[PDB]
Amino acid sequence: TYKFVNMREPSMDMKSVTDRAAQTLLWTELVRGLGMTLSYLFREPATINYPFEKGPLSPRFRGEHALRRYPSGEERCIACKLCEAVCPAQAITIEAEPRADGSRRTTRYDIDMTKCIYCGFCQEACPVDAIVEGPNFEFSTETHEELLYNKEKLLNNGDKWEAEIAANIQADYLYR
Amino acid sequence: ASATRVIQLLRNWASGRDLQAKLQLRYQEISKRTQPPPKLPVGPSHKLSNNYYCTRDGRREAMPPSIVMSSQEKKAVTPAPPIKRWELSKDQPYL
Amino acid sequence: SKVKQDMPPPGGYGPIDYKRNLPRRGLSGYSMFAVGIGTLLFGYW
Amino acid sequence: YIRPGGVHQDLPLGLLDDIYEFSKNFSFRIDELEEMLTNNRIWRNRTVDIGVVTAEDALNYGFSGVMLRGSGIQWDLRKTQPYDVYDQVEFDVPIGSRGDCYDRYLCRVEEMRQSLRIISQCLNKMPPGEIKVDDAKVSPPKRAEMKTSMESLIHHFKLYTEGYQVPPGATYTAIEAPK
Amino acid sequence: GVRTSPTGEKVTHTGQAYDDGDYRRVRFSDRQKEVNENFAIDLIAEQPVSEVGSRVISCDGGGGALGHPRVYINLDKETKTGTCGYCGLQFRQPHH
Amino acid sequence: GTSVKPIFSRDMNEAKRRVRELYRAWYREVPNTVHLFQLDISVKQGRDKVREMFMKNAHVTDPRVVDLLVIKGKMELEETINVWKQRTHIMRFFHETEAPRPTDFLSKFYVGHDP
Amino acid sequence: MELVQVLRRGLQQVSGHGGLRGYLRVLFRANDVRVGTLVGEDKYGNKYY
Amino acid sequence: AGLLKKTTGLVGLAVCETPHERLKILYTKILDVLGQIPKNAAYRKYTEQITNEKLGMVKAEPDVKKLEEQLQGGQIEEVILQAENELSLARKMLRWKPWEPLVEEPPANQWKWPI
Amino acid sequence: DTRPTIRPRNDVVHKQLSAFGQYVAEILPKYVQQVQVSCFNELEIFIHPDGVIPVLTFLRDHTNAQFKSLADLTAVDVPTRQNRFEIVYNLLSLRFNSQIRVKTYTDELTPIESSVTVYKAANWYEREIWDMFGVFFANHPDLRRILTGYGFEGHPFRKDFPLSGYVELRYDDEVKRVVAEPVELAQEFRKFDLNSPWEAFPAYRQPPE
Ligand code: SF4
Ligand code: SF4
Ligand SMILES: [Zn+2]
């Protein structure tokens, strides 16, 4: 089906042309605009008071990455090396090494924030939910260097936002 | 919402319509952000009875382009029947 | 358990208005001219 | 969100309700645009009879979507070649009749309303079922199945490192983007 | 825990240590060398050793869906206590 | 195999014939481009530079190839005279920012392990 | 009637923001003069509403 | 037939007030220009199969309103336009002459993807 | 579909397109070397380089084809083929809602006379195929660069052209102007050899060669 959008039939009776002349002479349609915006002013605004109040978000939010650890506290990461293999920007660099215990985890988990694109594929890639990416978005900076996150930086951030992301995946893993 | 009936009248008259019926903002009508856990369904082929992948081989069932003519009375046809002139929208023909 | 996912209400959601509700308002063209001229002679008088 | 084989995840519970509330109020917001602009002389005179193109040149220029529809060209991908569910839904294609900029502007705002028709029809007709195809060779297995079923682990492994192999060939798949 | 290098330079769990000159150290000047105080190796070593009397025990790691891929580590080695690869926490059979 | 298509020129004779007047255009422009682009180089070094890129590929025998650089080289003289390119786009040919690359065998050996 | 009530909350806003000092504090510090119920308080002084 | 259509719904396209005979003397013309082409030509057999056949109802049935669904070709004011391209196309392969064998067989196994 | 996983086929369009394939085939046995209809109801017309005007003009004005919409034309640089380039036009027919694909082979030096006369949409659709690939189009209004940088050297979409290219820019404060240098990355591309050594779908397997 379809419908026309500009087939207009201006009736040429003496009545109708009076409105058309009234429209042109007295700026009726322009006055419609004035009363239109006036009604908008007489309405409330919707400007949220940042940072005293921020935008509404969702448990599935993708933000800043943070490596987590088990309830025991050992790092979930086992260097399966899936995340960099799917990482569409190759922002994840990592090299595994033997460990003293034999639970040979990685000596390197460096995610370049200025190369990464926050698809969240790393979360889906990780079979042990080691690399998740938290709800934080305030991690701005002034020098390009501090965005080259390293294994220590992710571990510290994971220990920081651990209170938040733990509940987020708690309320979202059923969907995943 | 907050707004008194006085300037509600000003918005309604100036806009030519009642705006209290629906507003561009949100209110208690929004579903609360602690929705109960779901129970997402299972796949159609999730049965543990006969489910051999030899049946559904979507990637495998594809075939090379069929050879019909290669370099190495009649009738005239078309790649498809000519299009059908759709009729006007019965809901609203002319804007 | 029983399957749970975001589903519409059993009767479905309410109808969604989509027409243009441009407001047929104001006065007749003659009335504006009549009133527009009407205030005039008041001024000259 | 739109991955080969369906979608990545499910809608969160109640998500359809909020978009239903949004759908109700947006028809008014369209009226704000038309009331603001459609009859305004300054808007029209800067737009009407401006940049007009005939149907033949428009088609020969390789134009598409609203560009053809504004010039009265009778064509729409969602209707002529209905991909996905677009066959099981009704909407009126807003064909213009002048080809100038104003005709397209009316066509676009009408496309808004007709888009709102699709939201309502899809809302009342959202079926149950799974989110991705039931083929782990192209769809990563569910996280729950990942950690209990070995076939899922292999399928998830090779999918996120090697990825599914698409059979050789070629294809130009076409959909009507809003542009 | 965390140790300290001769230059102070708290050594991370991996074992990184900038040597005496090592001009690259200048980047830590006027700044802090971010190191995670919690070290995984000794933060799991003190965890209690599980005592389950079976040959094969699952090791999902708590919250099966939320944990790690469940393994079926063997419990017949009496020399040392068999641990899950992903979990790292140790299972031992009480007198087998 | 040997028999092939004349993209624009049958014979190497008319290949230079396309090189000639294009060089004439690529000779004439130097005073005006150096003027309005507001550079610092002199006209003469612009002139002898024009010779320089006319030189490196003055060793091909296939008529199609040489006249393909003719249209290839035809494609910047207007990109310059209609001020489409930038000052950074014609100083680029005047390779200046890099230190002189090593020529002697000793210099390569000292710098690194790369021929 | 309504205008009186809208004025009436305004002094109620002053009472809510600990008299004059709190009202002047919050408006010069947060540009917000609206008071809501207390919901929590962390171990930082970050007072929430 | 009936009252002349004010507009055909396509900008640039104009409503021709004498469409039936315009289709007639167009349709004869492709039949005329087809005379030059050889009988063995695949074009000609397809041409005459839809030219005088579709010259049929337009000669017989004079109501263009019924002629819309006689040819399933849309509005008549572009059918005569479409007939124009067919007359135009007939001139084109009066020069292409495509019924000879291939100019060149495809060099080796260039086709046959994948590689 | 009894198997919802697999995509259903449509033989109705399939052999109708196959019928139309022979239709165009018999008209031009001098041009149409190869006709192929794939599994997903896609028609392919493999043509000779000389035929860019005739068959497209045929496909555009014919009563039984009416393909006037130039969807796109693209090259597929295949090194192992003697004709590396493969210009692939796409046509859309409003009257029959179908799609037609035509292919022509080319070397670096062999030219294609411009199809601007047939499809005037093709005006801008050679300025990048000349840029990205380097196939020159004969008798064409303008062959300018619109994707590559002003004065950029090479044809990047050529499969022998590196991902990172050769030139990297930087604002040099010595000359107060951005300038190019040989590229040197912070990190090199960790290329992955993810092609499994075990054979894929045997349907398109290559014959014993
Ligand atoms: S979201 Fe994860 S996988 Fe995607 S680019 Fe960023 S780090 Fe890589
Ligand atoms: S973070 Fe997860 S996906 Fe990445 S290497 Fe470690 S275990 Fe593998
Ligand atoms: Zn475990």
Coordinates of N, CA and C in Angstrom, one line a residue, chain I residues 32-160:
Chain I
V32 N 28.3 -12.8 -23.7 CA 28.0 -13.6 -22.5 C 28.8 -14.9 -22.6
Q33 N 29.9 -14.9 -21.9 CA 30.7 -16.1 -21.8 C 30.1 -17.1 -20.8
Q34 N 29.6 -16.6 -19.7 CA 29.2 -17.5 -18.6 C 28.0 -16.9 -17.9
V35 N 27.0 -17.7 -17.7 CA 25.8 -17.4 -17.0 C 25.6 -18.4 -15.8
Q36 N 25.3 -17.9 -14.6 CA 25.3 -18.7 -13.4 C 24.2 -18.2 -12.5
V37 N 23.3 -19.0 -12.0 CA 22.3 -18.7 -11.0 C 22.7 -19.5 -9.8
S38 N 23.0 -18.8 -8.7 CA 23.5 -19.5 -7.5 C 22.3 -20.1 -6.7
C39 N 22.6 -20.6 -5.5 CA 21.6 -21.2 -4.7 C 20.6 -20.2 -4.2
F40 N 21.1 -19.0 -3.8 CA 20.2 -18.0 -3.2 C 19.7 -17.0 -4.3
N41 N 19.2 -17.6 -5.4 CA 18.4 -16.9 -6.4 C 19.1 -15.7 -6.9
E42 N 20.4 -15.8 -7.2 CA 21.2 -14.6 -7.7 C 21.7 -15.0 -9.1
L43 N 21.5 -14.1 -10.0 CA 21.9 -14.3 -11.4 C 23.2 -13.6 -11.7
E44 N 24.1 -14.2 -12.4 CA 25.4 -13.7 -12.7 C 25.6 -13.8 -14.3
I45 N 25.9 -12.7 -14.9 CA 26.2 -12.6 -16.3 C 27.7 -12.3 -16.4
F46 N 28.5 -13.3 -16.8 CA 29.9 -13.0 -17.0 C 30.2 -12.6 -18.4
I47 N 30.6 -11.3 -18.6 CA 30.8 -10.7 -19.9 C 32.3 -10.4 -20.1
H48 N 32.5 -10.1 -21.4 CA 33.8 -9.7 -22.0 C 34.0 -8.2 -21.7
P49 N 35.3 -7.8 -21.5 CA 35.5 -6.3 -21.2 C 34.9 -5.4 -22.3
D50 N 34.8 -5.8 -23.5 CA 34.3 -4.9 -24.5 C 32.8 -4.6 -24.4
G51 N 32.1 -5.4 -23.6 CA 30.7 -5.4 -23.5 C 30.0 -4.5 -22.4
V52 N 30.8 -3.5 -21.9 CA 30.2 -2.8 -20.8 C 29.1 -1.9 -21.2
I53 N 29.2 -1.3 -22.4 CA 28.0 -0.5 -22.9 C 26.9 -1.5 -23.4
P54 N 27.1 -2.4 -24.3 CA 26.0 -3.1 -25.0 C 25.1 -3.8 -24.0
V55 N 25.6 -4.7 -23.2 CA 24.8 -5.5 -22.3 C 24.1 -4.7 -21.3
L56 N 24.8 -3.7 -20.7 CA 24.1 -2.8 -19.8 C 23.1 -1.9 -20.5
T57 N 23.4 -1.4 -21.6 CA 22.3 -0.7 -22.4 C 21.2 -1.7 -22.8
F58 N 21.5 -2.9 -23.1 CA 20.5 -3.9 -23.3 C 19.7 -4.1 -22.0
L59 N 20.4 -4.4 -20.9 CA 19.6 -4.6 -19.7 C 18.9 -3.4 -19.2
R60 N 19.2 -2.2 -19.7 CA 18.5 -1.0 -19.2 C 17.3 -0.6 -20.0
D61 N 17.3 -0.9 -21.4 CA 16.2 -0.5 -22.2 C 15.3 -1.6 -22.7
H62 N 15.6 -2.9 -22.4 CA 14.9 -4.0 -22.9 C 13.5 -4.1 -22.3
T63 N 12.5 -4.5 -23.0 CA 11.2 -4.7 -22.5 C 11.1 -5.8 -21.5
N64 N 11.8 -6.9 -21.6 CA 11.8 -8.0 -20.8 C 12.8 -8.0 -19.6
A65 N 13.6 -6.9 -19.6 CA 14.6 -6.8 -18.5 C 14.4 -5.6 -17.7
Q66 N 14.4 -4.4 -18.3 CA 14.1 -3.1 -17.5 C 15.0 -3.0 -16.3
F67 N 16.3 -3.2 -16.4 CA 17.2 -3.0 -15.3 C 17.9 -1.7 -15.5
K68 N 17.3 -0.6 -14.9 CA 17.9 0.7 -15.0 C 18.6 1.2 -13.7
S69 N 18.6 0.4 -12.6 CA 19.1 0.9 -11.4 C 20.5 0.3 -11.2
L70 N 21.5 1.2 -11.2 CA 22.9 0.8 -11.0 C 23.1 0.7 -9.5
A71 N 23.0 -0.6 -9.0 CA 23.2 -0.8 -7.5 C 24.6 -0.4 -7.1
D72 N 25.6 -1.0 -7.8 CA 27.0 -0.8 -7.5 C 27.9 -1.5 -8.5
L73 N 29.1 -1.0 -8.6 CA 30.1 -1.7 -9.4 C 31.4 -1.8 -8.5
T74 N 32.0 -3.0 -8.4 CA 33.1 -3.2 -7.5 C 34.1 -4.1 -8.2
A75 N 35.4 -4.0 -7.7 CA 36.4 -4.9 -8.2 C 36.8 -5.9 -7.1
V76 N 37.3 -7.0 -7.5 CA 37.7 -8.1 -6.6 C 39.1 -8.5 -7.1
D77 N 40.1 -7.8 -6.5 CA 41.5 -8.1 -6.8 C 41.9 -9.5 -6.5
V78 N 42.1 -10.4 -7.5 CA 42.5 -11.7 -7.2 C 43.9 -11.9 -7.8
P79 N 44.9 -12.0 -7.0 CA 46.3 -12.1 -7.5 C 46.5 -13.3 -8.3
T80 N 45.9 -14.5 -8.0 CA 46.2 -15.7 -8.7 C 45.7 -15.8 -10.1
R81 N 44.7 -14.9 -10.4 CA 44.1 -14.8 -11.7 C 45.0 -14.0 -12.6
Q82 N 45.2 -14.3 -13.8 CA 46.0 -13.5 -14.7 C 45.3 -12.1 -14.9
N83 N 44.0 -12.1 -14.9 CA 43.3 -10.8 -14.8 C 43.0 -10.6 -13.4
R84 N 43.8 -9.8 -12.7 CA 43.7 -9.6 -11.2 C 42.3 -9.0 -10.9
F85 N 41.9 -7.9 -11.6 CA 40.7 -7.2 -11.3 C 39.5 -7.9 -11.8
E86 N 38.3 -7.7 -11.2 CA 37.0 -8.2 -11.6 C 36.0 -7.2 -11.3
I87 N 35.7 -6.4 -12.3 CA 34.7 -5.3 -12.1 C 33.3 -6.0 -12.1
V88 N 32.5 -5.7 -11.1 CA 31.2 -6.4 -10.9 C 30.1 -5.4 -10.8
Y89 N 29.4 -5.1 -11.8 CA 28.2 -4.2 -11.8 C 27.1 -5.0 -11.1
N90 N 26.1 -4.2 -10.6 CA 24.9 -4.7 -10.1 C 23.7 -3.9 -10.6
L91 N 22.7 -4.6 -11.1 CA 21.5 -3.9 -11.7 C 20.3 -4.3 -10.9
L92 N 19.4 -3.4 -10.8 CA 18.1 -3.6 -10.1 C 17.0 -3.2 -11.1
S93 N 16.0 -4.1 -11.2 CA 14.8 -3.8 -12.1 C 13.6 -3.5 -11.2
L94 N 13.1 -2.3 -11.4 CA 11.9 -1.9 -10.7 C 10.7 -2.7 -11.1
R95 N 10.6 -3.0 -12.4 CA 9.4 -3.7 -13.0 C 9.4 -5.1 -12.5
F96 N 10.5 -5.8 -12.4 CA 10.6 -7.2 -12.0 C 11.3 -7.5 -10.7
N97 N 11.6 -6.4 -9.9 CA 12.1 -6.5 -8.5 C 13.3 -7.5 -8.4
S98 N 14.0 -7.7 -9.5 CA 15.1 -8.6 -9.5 C 16.5 -7.9 -9.6
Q99 N 17.5 -8.7 -9.4 CA 18.9 -8.2 -9.4 C 19.7 -8.9 -10.4
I100 N 20.6 -8.2 -11.1 CA 21.5 -8.8 -12.1 C 22.9 -8.3 -11.8
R101 N 23.8 -9.3 -11.9 CA 25.2 -9.1 -11.6 C 26.0 -9.4 -12.9
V102 N 26.9 -8.5 -13.3 CA 27.7 -8.7 -14.5 C 29.2 -8.5 -14.1
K103 N 30.0 -9.4 -14.6 CA 31.5 -9.4 -14.3 C 32.3 -9.3 -15.5
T104 N 33.4 -8.4 -15.4 CA 34.3 -8.3 -16.5 C 35.7 -8.4 -15.9
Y105 N 36.6 -9.1 -16.6 CA 38.0 -9.3 -16.1 C 38.9 -8.2 -16.7
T106 N 40.0 -7.9 -16.0 CA 40.9 -6.9 -16.4 C 42.3 -7.1 -15.8
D107 N 43.3 -6.6 -16.5 CA 44.7 -6.5 -15.9 C 44.9 -5.1 -15.4
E108 N 46.1 -4.8 -15.0 CA 46.4 -3.4 -14.6 C 46.3 -2.4 -15.7
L109 N 46.6 -2.9 -16.9 CA 46.8 -2.0 -18.0 C 45.6 -2.0 -19.0
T110 N 44.9 -3.1 -19.1 CA 43.8 -3.1 -20.0 C 42.7 -2.1 -19.5
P111 N 42.2 -1.3 -20.3 CA 41.2 -0.3 -19.9 C 39.7 -0.8 -20.1
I112 N 38.8 -0.2 -19.3 CA 37.4 -0.3 -19.5 C 36.9 1.0 -19.9
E113 N 36.3 1.1 -21.1 CA 35.6 2.3 -21.5 C 34.4 2.6 -20.5
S114 N 34.3 3.9 -20.1 CA 33.4 4.3 -19.1 C 32.0 3.9 -19.4
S115 N 31.2 3.5 -18.4 CA 29.8 3.2 -18.5 C 29.0 4.4 -18.1
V116 N 29.5 5.6 -18.2 CA 28.8 6.8 -17.8 C 27.6 7.0 -18.7
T117 N 27.8 6.7 -20.0 CA 26.7 6.9 -21.0 C 25.5 5.9 -20.6
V118 N 25.8 4.7 -20.3 CA 24.7 3.8 -19.9 C 24.1 4.2 -18.6
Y119 N 24.9 4.1 -17.5 CA 24.4 4.6 -16.2 C 25.2 5.8 -15.8
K120 N 24.5 7.0 -15.8 CA 25.2 8.2 -15.3 C 25.4 8.3 -13.8
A121 N 24.8 7.3 -13.1 CA 25.2 7.1 -11.7 C 26.7 6.7 -11.6
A122 N 27.2 6.1 -12.6 CA 28.6 5.5 -12.6 C 29.7 6.6 -12.6
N123 N 29.3 7.9 -12.7 CA 30.2 9.0 -12.8 C 31.2 8.9 -11.6
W124 N 30.6 9.0 -10.4 CA 31.4 8.9 -9.2 C 31.8 7.5 -8.8
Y125 N 31.3 6.5 -9.5 CA 31.6 5.1 -9.1 C 32.8 4.5 -9.8
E126 N 33.5 5.3 -10.6 CA 34.9 5.0 -11.1 C 36.0 5.8 -10.4
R127 N 35.6 7.0 -9.9 CA 36.7 7.8 -9.2 C 37.3 7.1 -8.0
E128 N 36.7 6.1 -7.4 CA 37.2 5.3 -6.4 C 37.7 4.0 -6.8
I129 N 37.1 3.3 -7.8 CA 37.6 2.1 -8.3 C 39.0 2.3 -9.0
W130 N 39.1 3.5 -9.5 CA 40.5 3.9 -10.0 C 41.4 4.2 -8.8
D131 N 40.8 4.8 -7.7 CA 41.6 5.1 -6.6 C 42.0 3.8 -5.8
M132 N 41.0 3.1 -5.4 CA 41.2 1.9 -4.5 C 42.0 0.8 -5.2
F133 N 41.7 0.6 -6.5 CA 42.3 -0.6 -7.2 C 43.3 -0.2 -8.3
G134 N 43.0 0.9 -9.0 CA 43.9 1.3 -10.0 C 43.5 1.0 -11.4
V135 N 42.4 0.3 -11.6 CA 41.9 0.1 -12.9 C 41.4 1.4 -13.6
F136 N 42.1 1.8 -14.7 CA 41.7 3.0 -15.3 C 40.5 2.8 -16.2
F137 N 39.6 3.8 -16.2 CA 38.4 3.7 -17.0 C 38.5 4.7 -18.2
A138 N 38.4 4.1 -19.4 CA 38.6 4.9 -20.6 C 37.4 5.9 -20.8
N139 N 37.6 6.9 -21.7 CA 36.7 7.9 -22.1 C 35.7 8.3 -21.0
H140 N 36.2 8.8 -19.9 CA 35.4 9.1 -18.7 C 35.6 10.6 -18.4
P141 N 34.5 11.3 -17.9 CA 34.7 12.7 -17.7 C 35.8 13.1 -16.8
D142 N 35.9 12.5 -15.6 CA 37.0 12.9 -14.6 C 37.4 11.6 -13.9
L143 N 38.7 11.4 -13.7 CA 39.2 10.3 -13.0 C 39.9 10.7 -11.7
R144 N 39.3 11.6 -11.0 CA 40.1 12.2 -9.9 C 40.0 11.3 -8.7
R145 N 40.9 11.7 -7.7 CA 40.9 11.0 -6.4 C 40.0 11.6 -5.4
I146 N 39.1 10.8 -4.8 CA 38.1 11.2 -3.9 C 38.1 10.5 -2.6
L147 N 38.8 9.3 -2.5 CA 39.0 8.6 -1.3 C 40.4 8.7 -0.7
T148 N 41.4 8.5 -1.6 CA 42.8 8.6 -1.1 C 43.1 10.1 -0.9
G149 N 44.2 10.3 -0.1 CA 44.6 11.6 0.2 C 45.1 12.3 -1.0
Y150 N 45.1 13.7 -1.0 CA 45.6 14.5 -2.1 C 47.0 14.1 -2.4
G151 N 47.3 13.6 -3.6 CA 48.6 13.2 -3.9 C 49.1 11.9 -3.3
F152 N 48.2 11.1 -2.7 CA 48.6 9.8 -2.2 C 49.0 8.9 -3.3
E153 N 50.0 8.1 -3.0 CA 50.6 7.2 -4.0 C 50.1 5.7 -3.7
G154 N 49.7 5.1 -4.8 CA 49.3 3.7 -4.7 C 47.8 3.5 -4.9
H155 N 47.4 2.2 -4.8 CA 46.0 1.8 -4.9 C 45.7 0.9 -3.7
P156 N 45.3 1.4 -2.6 CA 45.3 0.7 -1.3 C 44.5 -0.6 -1.3
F157 N 43.4 -0.7 -2.0 CA 42.6 -1.9 -2.0 C 43.2 -3.0 -2.7
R158 N 44.3 -2.8 -3.5 CA 45.0 -3.9 -4.1 C 45.6 -4.8 -3.0
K159 N 45.4 -6.1 -3.1 CA 45.7 -7.0 -2.1 C 47.2 -7.1 -1.8
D160 N 48.1 -6.5 -2.6 CA 49.5 -6.4 -2.4 C 49.9 -5.1 -1.6

